[PDB]
Amino acid sequence: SGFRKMAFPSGKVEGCMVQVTCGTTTLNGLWLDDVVYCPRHVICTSEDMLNPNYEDLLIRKSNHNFLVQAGNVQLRVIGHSMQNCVLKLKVDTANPKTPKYKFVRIQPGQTFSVLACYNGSPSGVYQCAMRPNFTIKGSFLNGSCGSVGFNIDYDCVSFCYMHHMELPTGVHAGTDLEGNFYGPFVDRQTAQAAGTDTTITVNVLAWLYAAVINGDRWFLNRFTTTLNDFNLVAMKYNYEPLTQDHVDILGPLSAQTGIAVLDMCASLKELLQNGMNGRTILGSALLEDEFTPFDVVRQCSGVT
Amino acid sequence: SGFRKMAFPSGKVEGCMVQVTCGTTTLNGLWLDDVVYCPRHVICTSEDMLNPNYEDLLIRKSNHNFLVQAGNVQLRVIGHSMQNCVLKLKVDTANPKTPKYKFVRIQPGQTFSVLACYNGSPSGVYQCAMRPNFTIKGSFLNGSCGSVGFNIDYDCVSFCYMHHMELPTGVHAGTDLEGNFYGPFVDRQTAQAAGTDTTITVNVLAWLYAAVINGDRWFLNRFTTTLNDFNLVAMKYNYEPLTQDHVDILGPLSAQTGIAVLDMCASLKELLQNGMNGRTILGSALLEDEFTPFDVVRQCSGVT
Ligand SMILES: *C(=O)/C(=C/c1ccc(N2CCOCC2)s1)NC(=O)c1cccs1
Ligand SMILES: *C(=O)/C(=C/c1ccc(N2CCOCC2)s1)NC(=O)c1cccs1
């Protein structure tokens, strides 16, 4: 019993974190095999950040200008390249703690754990989701750049995010491990406003299923709805449209609880229309959307 | 920016988790130096659990009846003893991954990270608090017993909790690493009801300070209060009494924000009396109490 915002165990990723310094800028790097991945803005001064030409700035840098430190020992940089918004620093030593890994590009609504780091050292781990506007609501201070987001499937770490910046609004933007930003964000200190942060409907429904499995059932009503009727209500409340693919994904939770997906949609529609009335669901006074149907199944089943 | 329910990096604790089996019961153990710590109820059958005499049940067990497996390799048990509600299994091999560690007994209101494990393997990490009724609101399934709670200070892991049971109400109880239960709970399947789960006032105030530091200031009012007036309101809302020790502990957050502790108490008093009115603070519709003043300082400063 109980349902918590749970992150993956971070050990495998802690063994990959290094400090990268270029000139006066220090941030974090991810060391996998003989390559250290880090945000390309490590080459920028605070002034360069206003309008950087990364190709031009990188010409003034050599291998010896990138200082890579792994747990108080210096790594030798024998090559460097820019791939989109990340730098790949080839080092002469393969990371002995390299886990099995993949680089994945996630879709909005997908969750992942972040290992927040400073100066190559881990400070904490938390769970978040790729928002529908392609921002993440993290907890990052200056120097956290290069901290990564990941999911674990048994022994394989799928790296999906690398932190690059905080928007003027306090929300966060970054890239996949190929250096491509999620959303329309650029690594420049310029006017970048995020779009509507809509609620991830399929995740709210998954969390309502977790609530039923954990005994919190007060919100279950005597109604049902259709996908089209539910979506008229969802659009009005800034919830993402629910598709038949989402209904299919909720199948296992629907089967476990015996609650048809469309019945849970009708319960959620009434919660949107009536509010919580001062009540809570799984200790929350708002509808939680940073648990995917997969996270709910995983947590409720005890996947290790 | 941003404020997240952040757990400590779990790597150091992942390297200590083992599987302990006695007969048909399998749970988790913590391997530190040449000792494996686990709940003594590993010797119980589901029937024994109704009214166990642990001393008597332990007489029927020898070293070879405790099977300890660390990452698919078997450890040799060369001694066993019962200390309060934990068993200490002496093994012939010191854990090579033993971090610097301490065993601490925490007070209610204190937070810690839990590394939920099944069959000696980590499944997830989350942050929780020792409630004022000495329960924890975790996320534990059968087989999670022996999972531990901990805090990290740089390189020293202070182990403070070991999971032993779920109360009939779905909340959790366990011991410190000396085997002493937090609260009045016993490791027996009997009627054990928890006391009032009051709100940890000093932690709510700390989180309101985190909110101000992160730009969420709508709740700041033009009033102040006294400790005695605030506490009359706190008692009415099932909040723990605020003491001068708590005021002193909030000193650093009061200094950083320039908001006197008693002014923040008056803001909190108005939130209790008026409610949130459909508004949120740090993305929450309720007042969060599982962040200590130390956690707020740590997260807002980037301690690694
Ligand atoms: C790296 O750690 C880092 C990079 C940034 C690049 C641009 C930034 N912003 C700040 C807001 O105004 C526009 C430019 S930040 N910093 C950070 O990720 C953070 C700094 C403070 C909090 S998080
Ligand atoms: C160990 O993993 C474990 C021990 C328990 C001992 C007594 C328990 N209860 C269950 C509720 O009724 C009274 C007796 S549980 N189990 C657990 O921690 C859990 C089992 C289900 C969820 S957590």
CA-CA distance, B10 to B290, in Å (whole number)?
19
Q: What is the resolution of this structure in A?
A: 1.6
A125 touching B (Cβ < 8 Å): yes
In terms of domains, do B281 and B207 share one?
yes
In terms of domains, do B22 and B77 share one?
yes
CA-CA distance, B208 to B225, in Å (whole number)?
16
Q: Which domain holds residue B70?
A: 15-99
Residue A237: which CATH number? Answer: 1.10.1840.10
In terms of domains, do B63 and B164 share one?
no
Contact A224, A263 (CB under 8 A): yes
Concatenating the DSSP letter of every residue in B8-45 gives PP-HHHHTTEEEEEETTEEEEEEEETTEEEEEGGGG--
CA-CA distance, A204 to A133, in Å (whole number)?
17
Q: How many domains does chain A have?
A: 3
H or E, element range at B86: strand B86-91
Q: A143: CA distance to ligand 1 center in Å?
A: 8
What are the φ/ψ torsions at residue A136 (nearest 5 degrees)?
-125, 150
Of B99, B132, B150, the one marking the end of a domain is B99
In terms of domains, do B2 and B144 share one?
yes
CA-CA distance, B229 to A82, in Å (whole number)?
61
CA-CA distance, B119 to B97, in Å (whole number)?
19
Closest ligand 2 atom, residue B145 Cα: 2
Of A99, A131, A164, the one marking the end of a domain is A99
The pair of structure tokens assigned to B119 is 């069959």
In terms of domains, do A241 and A266 share one?
yes
In terms of domains, do A129 and A60 share one?
no
Bridge-based pairing of strands B35-39 and B66-70 is: unpaired
The bound ligand whose nearest atom lies closest to the alpha carbon of A140 is: 1
What are the φ/ψ torsions at residue B91 (nearest 5 degrees)?
-110, 165
In terms of domains, do A271 and A153 share one?
no
Of A67, A99, A131, the one marking the end of a domain is A99
**Closest by Cα among A60, A65, A80, A67 to A18:** A67
- Residues in B closer than 8 angstroms to A144, CB to CB, are 302
Experimental method reported for this structure: X-ray
B165 lines ligand 2 (CB under 6 A): yes
**Closest by Cα among A296, A294, A229 to A263:** A229
B144 lines ligand 2 (CB under 6 A): yes
In terms of domains, do B159 and B221 share one?
no
* Distance between first and last Cα of chain B: 17
Residue nearest (by alpha carbon) to ligand 1 atom 17: A142
In terms of domains, do B214 and B65 share one?
no
Concatenating the DSSP letter of every residue in A127-196 gives EEE--TTS-B-----TT-TT-EEEEEETTEEEEEEEEEEE-TTS-EEEE-TTSPBSTT--SSSS------
The bound ligand whose nearest atom lies closest to the alpha carbon of A3 is: 2
* B206 CB-near residues (< 8 Å, 6+ apart): B250, B253, B291, B292, B293, B295, B296
Residue A86: which CATH number? Answer: 2.40.10.10
In terms of domains, do A292 and A233 share one?
yes
- Count of CB pairs separated by less than 8 Å, A with B: 147
